[PDB]
Design a protein around this ligand. Sequence first.
Ligand SMILES: Cc1cn([C@H]2C[C@H](OP(=O)(O)O)[C@@H](COP(=O)(O)O)O2)c(=O)[nH]c1=O
Ligand SMILES: [Ca+2]
Length: 129
Amino acid sequence: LHKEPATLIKAIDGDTVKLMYKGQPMTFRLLLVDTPEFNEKYGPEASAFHKKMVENAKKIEVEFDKGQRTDKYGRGLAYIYADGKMDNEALVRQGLAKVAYVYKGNNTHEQLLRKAEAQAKKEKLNIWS
Ligand SMILES: Cc1cn([C@H]2C[C@H](OP(=O)(O)O)[C@@H](COP(=O)(O)O)O2)c(=O)[nH]c1=O
Ligand SMILES: [Ca+2]
Protein backbone atom coordinates (compact mmCIF):
# COMPACT_ATOMS: atom_id res chain seq x y z
CA LEU A 1 0.00 0.00 0.00
CA HIS A 2 1.02 3.61 -0.77
CA LYS A 3 0.81 6.92 1.08
CA GLU A 4 -0.50 9.78 -1.02
CA PRO A 5 -0.63 13.46 -0.26
CA ALA A 6 -3.67 15.38 0.88
CA THR A 7 -4.42 18.58 2.90
CA LEU A 8 -6.99 19.12 5.61
CA ILE A 9 -10.08 21.01 4.57
CA LYS A 10 -11.98 20.48 7.82
CA ALA A 11 -12.31 18.15 10.84
CA ILE A 12 -15.72 16.47 10.92
CA ASP A 13 -16.00 13.80 13.66
CA GLY A 14 -14.29 10.73 15.18
CA ASP A 15 -14.03 8.71 12.01
CA THR A 16 -14.58 11.18 9.14
CA VAL A 17 -12.53 14.14 7.93
CA LYS A 18 -12.76 16.46 4.92
CA LEU A 19 -9.57 16.51 2.88
CA MET A 20 -8.42 17.77 -0.45
CA TYR A 21 -7.19 14.79 -2.36
CA LYS A 22 -5.77 15.11 -5.98
CA GLY A 23 -7.09 18.70 -5.77
CA GLN A 24 -10.73 17.74 -5.00
CA PRO A 25 -12.60 18.05 -1.73
CA MET A 26 -13.72 14.71 -0.36
CA THR A 27 -15.08 13.34 2.87
CA PHE A 28 -12.95 10.41 4.01
CA ARG A 29 -14.32 7.62 6.23
CA LEU A 30 -11.58 5.83 8.20
CA LEU A 31 -11.23 2.21 7.30
CA LEU A 32 -11.78 -0.55 9.87
CA VAL A 33 -13.04 1.55 12.75
CA ASP A 34 -16.19 2.94 14.32
CA THR A 35 -16.35 5.86 16.65
CA PRO A 36 -19.44 6.75 18.73
CA GLU A 37 -21.61 9.47 17.06
CA PHE A 38 -21.13 12.96 18.60
CA ASN A 39 -24.30 12.61 20.65
CA GLU A 40 -23.32 9.21 22.23
CA LYS A 41 -20.95 8.39 25.00
CA TYR A 42 -17.26 9.11 24.07
CA GLY A 43 -18.54 10.71 20.84
CA PRO A 44 -17.44 14.16 21.70
CA GLU A 45 -14.05 12.85 22.98
CA ALA A 46 -13.46 10.89 19.71
CA SER A 47 -14.33 13.92 17.59
CA ALA A 48 -12.04 16.06 19.72
CA PHE A 49 -9.21 13.60 19.49
CA HIS A 50 -9.47 13.21 15.72
CA LYS A 51 -9.82 16.98 15.23
CA LYS A 52 -6.70 17.75 17.21
CA MET A 53 -4.76 15.10 15.42
CA VAL A 54 -5.65 16.35 11.92
CA GLU A 55 -5.43 20.11 12.79
CA ASN A 56 -1.95 19.75 14.31
CA ALA A 57 -0.51 17.71 11.47
CA LYS A 58 1.87 19.45 9.23
CA LYS A 59 1.48 16.53 6.76
CA ILE A 60 -1.71 14.49 6.09
CA GLU A 61 -1.47 11.38 3.93
CA VAL A 62 -4.14 9.11 2.39
CA GLU A 63 -3.53 5.37 2.01
CA PHE A 64 -6.13 3.40 0.13
CA ASP A 65 -6.36 -0.33 0.68
CA LYS A 66 -6.73 -2.96 -2.08
CA GLY A 67 -10.50 -2.81 -2.53
CA GLN A 68 -13.16 -0.19 -2.97
CA ARG A 69 -11.92 3.37 -2.45
CA THR A 70 -15.32 5.03 -2.15
CA ASP A 71 -18.32 3.80 -0.23
CA LYS A 72 -22.03 3.99 -1.13
CA TYR A 73 -22.29 7.57 0.20
CA GLY A 74 -19.35 8.72 -1.93
CA ARG A 75 -16.96 8.95 1.03
CA GLY A 76 -13.34 8.04 0.43
CA LEU A 77 -12.28 4.85 2.27
CA ALA A 78 -8.72 5.12 3.52
CA TYR A 79 -6.16 4.90 6.21
CA ILE A 80 -5.34 8.50 7.12
CA TYR A 81 -1.93 9.52 8.56
CA ALA A 82 -1.07 12.68 10.54
CA ASP A 83 2.70 13.24 10.56
CA GLY A 84 3.16 9.55 9.91
CA LYS A 85 0.82 8.36 12.73
CA MET A 86 -2.28 6.53 11.52
CA ASP A 87 -5.48 8.22 12.70
CA ASN A 88 -7.37 4.89 12.51
CA GLU A 89 -4.90 3.18 14.84
CA ALA A 90 -4.55 6.12 17.21
CA LEU A 91 -8.32 6.26 17.85
CA VAL A 92 -8.48 2.50 18.50
CA ARG A 93 -5.40 2.55 20.73
CA GLN A 94 -7.06 5.20 22.91
CA GLY A 95 -10.29 3.29 23.20
CA LEU A 96 -12.15 6.03 21.30
CA ALA A 97 -12.98 3.64 18.41
CA LYS A 98 -13.70 -0.04 17.93
CA VAL A 99 -12.42 -2.20 15.17
CA ALA A 100 -15.43 -2.53 12.84
CA TYR A 101 -16.57 -2.74 9.28
CA VAL A 102 -13.94 -5.28 8.33
CA TYR A 103 -14.79 -6.29 4.77
CA LYS A 104 -12.67 -8.76 2.80
CA GLY A 105 -10.00 -7.17 0.60
CA ASN A 106 -10.00 -3.73 2.35
CA ASN A 107 -8.47 -5.19 5.49
CA THR A 108 -4.73 -4.80 5.29
CA HIS A 109 -4.30 -3.22 8.67
CA GLU A 110 -6.84 -5.40 10.47
CA GLN A 111 -4.39 -7.17 12.72
CA LEU A 112 -2.46 -3.99 13.60
CA LEU A 113 -5.70 -2.34 14.74
CA ARG A 114 -6.97 -5.38 16.61
CA LYS A 115 -3.67 -5.32 18.49
CA ALA A 116 -4.25 -1.72 19.44
CA GLU A 117 -7.81 -2.50 20.51
CA ALA A 118 -6.56 -5.35 22.72
CA GLN A 119 -4.09 -3.01 24.43
CA ALA A 120 -6.78 -0.28 24.83
CA LYS A 121 -9.14 -2.83 26.36
CA LYS A 122 -6.48 -4.16 28.72
CA GLU A 123 -5.94 -0.57 29.98
CA LYS A 124 -9.69 -0.11 30.30
CA LEU A 125 -9.42 3.12 28.24
CA ASN A 126 -12.48 5.20 27.50
CA ILE A 127 -14.93 2.91 25.70
CA TRP A 128 -13.49 -0.06 27.61
CA SER A 129 -13.69 1.56 31.13
C1 LIG B 1 -16.14 1.98 7.25
C2 LIG B 1 -17.06 1.62 6.10
C3 LIG B 1 -18.40 1.97 6.14
N1 LIG B 1 -19.27 1.67 5.16
C4 LIG B 1 -20.68 2.00 5.23
C5 LIG B 1 -21.34 0.85 6.00
C6 LIG B 1 -22.49 1.50 6.72
O1 LIG B 1 -23.76 1.43 5.96
P1 LIG B 1 -25.03 2.04 6.68
O2 LIG B 1 -25.03 3.55 6.62
O3 LIG B 1 -25.99 1.47 5.68
O4 LIG B 1 -25.13 1.60 8.08
C7 LIG B 1 -21.94 2.92 6.93
C8 LIG B 1 -21.28 3.10 8.28
O5 LIG B 1 -20.66 4.37 8.34
P2 LIG B 1 -20.77 5.31 9.61
O6 LIG B 1 -20.26 4.49 10.78
O7 LIG B 1 -19.96 6.54 9.21
O8 LIG B 1 -22.24 5.60 9.77
O9 LIG B 1 -20.92 3.11 6.02
C9 LIG B 1 -18.81 0.92 4.07
O10 LIG B 1 -19.64 0.67 3.15
N2 LIG B 1 -17.53 0.60 3.96
C10 LIG B 1 -16.63 0.80 4.96
O11 LIG B 1 -15.45 0.45 4.80
CA1 LIG C 1 -19.37 6.22 13.27
